[PDB]
Design a protein around this ligand. Structure first.
Ligand code: NAG
Ligand code: NAG
Ligand code: NAG
Ligand code: NAG
Lengths: 122, 122, 122, 122
């Protein structure tokens, strides 16, 4: 009854991710294949790097990771918690910030989008 | 000129961070010392890990990173862009999500805070 | 058809709200009965006031509203869009910010929570 | 003594707003002139409507309001708190969600931007 991040996951938009073994410092690496984009930039699998919080041997740890898109100048970060829901089943409930690139610091105000994603095992 | 992440930075709240070398894939690690908290827990320097976007090797790249707090069960993620400001200084304009740990999935809705930080070189 | 706000709605958290007539300027009022809290204080039905955007008279307009909670010192704002879903139901897709009250400007950083809600007709 | 929303205000981006008298239910109306946009539609002053919360005589109420843009199909909501600094100068520390109009519910994920604004009296 630990919710583990490692493994293969799919979210509510159709995107898939893989997360490998969580190491000695709570660190993990993975891959991210989004089902949605918004420019003639064609989707490609992109790496992610992140950590899970192991404070107090928490059975439902918090975590975060960054997606380093290999088809966009943008970055997304995701943060959430791994739950064991009503059916003994694992869910990652996350929110994200997607930072776009702007040309001038005066345009910074409009550069950051926000949303949610729920992941379940694939 | 190129706006680099590497080095020592202070933000508008008085927190410090140090980012190391950024490698060929954009990956970096570092340390974070927050000046603010809300726990009875003693603040402790905590590890950070992240990446900067290398698509088109932009002079003012986007990035993100995860701080894996070593005194709280929470996690923060920061996303941003490095700019050269009007005065020639490098500045990181960022936004963050701070994920708290909750016991039940039923409380997930209340678990995520949002805010900004501006970082300047120390 | 046009997706209209007027009427009785429920969200994924079980919360209820009722929106009155929308005037020619897009203004409406309503009431909101949250299913969730984190207070020792009992939930009470609370007023909301908002606007729907009328530019180009879109069939799936954007809108926002503020809920002035009767039993907490907090404020919540919601912004979204009313869509006709794939199955022909009206749905409101929203995000919100929940502003807590802090005693000192020094604690401002931690006072705003963010989340989503999806509303369907009751 | 009690921080008041009524008046003329300007923010960190150079936007101005006006807020009128607050009634006994904490409700107010106003106007908003943004200094920044991102289309060729001329910026036009736009109405706002909001409420402040003063449960149990808060000297620094939380509040929220909605800006009903008259030159965009979008909506912005702002929520924050009215702080009185110790020289008796007021500041509104706010965060906002800006909801863009999208054509298809499948694009809803990318519709909501987030940021901050600090307002002072003008
Ligand atoms: C993720 O995998 C599922 C099932 O294996 C597949 O049908 C779907 O196309 C994938 N989605 C992607 C790559 O976005
Ligand atoms: C950050 O480092 C500087 C020295 O470079 C020090 O004076 C300051 O107190 C440090 N702040 C924190 C919050 O650790
Ligand atoms: C919302 O309304 C329905 C009846 O239409 C009721 O069953 C439910 O208890 C209400 N929920 C709240 C939280 O008021
Ligand atoms: C707001 O007010 C000041 C003083 O009237 C003025 O200088 C500034 O141009 C105004 N900005 C906008 C966006 O209207």
């Amino acid at each position: 009854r630990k919710c583990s991040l490692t493994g293969k996951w799919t979210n509510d938009l159709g995107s898939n991710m893989t997360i490998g073994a969580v190491n000695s410092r709570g660190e993990f690496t993975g891959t991210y294949t989004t089902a949605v984009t918004a420019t003639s930039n064609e989707i490609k699998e992109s790496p992610l790097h992140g950590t899970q919080n192991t404070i107090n041997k928490r059975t439902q740890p918090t975590f975060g990771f960054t997606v380093n898109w290999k088809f966009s100048e943008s970055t997304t970060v995701f943060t959430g918690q791994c739950f064991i829901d009503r059916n003994g089943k694992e869910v990652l409930k996350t929110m994200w910030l997607l930072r776009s690139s702007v040309n001038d610091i005066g345009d910074d105000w409009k550069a950051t989008r926000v949303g949610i994603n729920i992941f379940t095992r694939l």
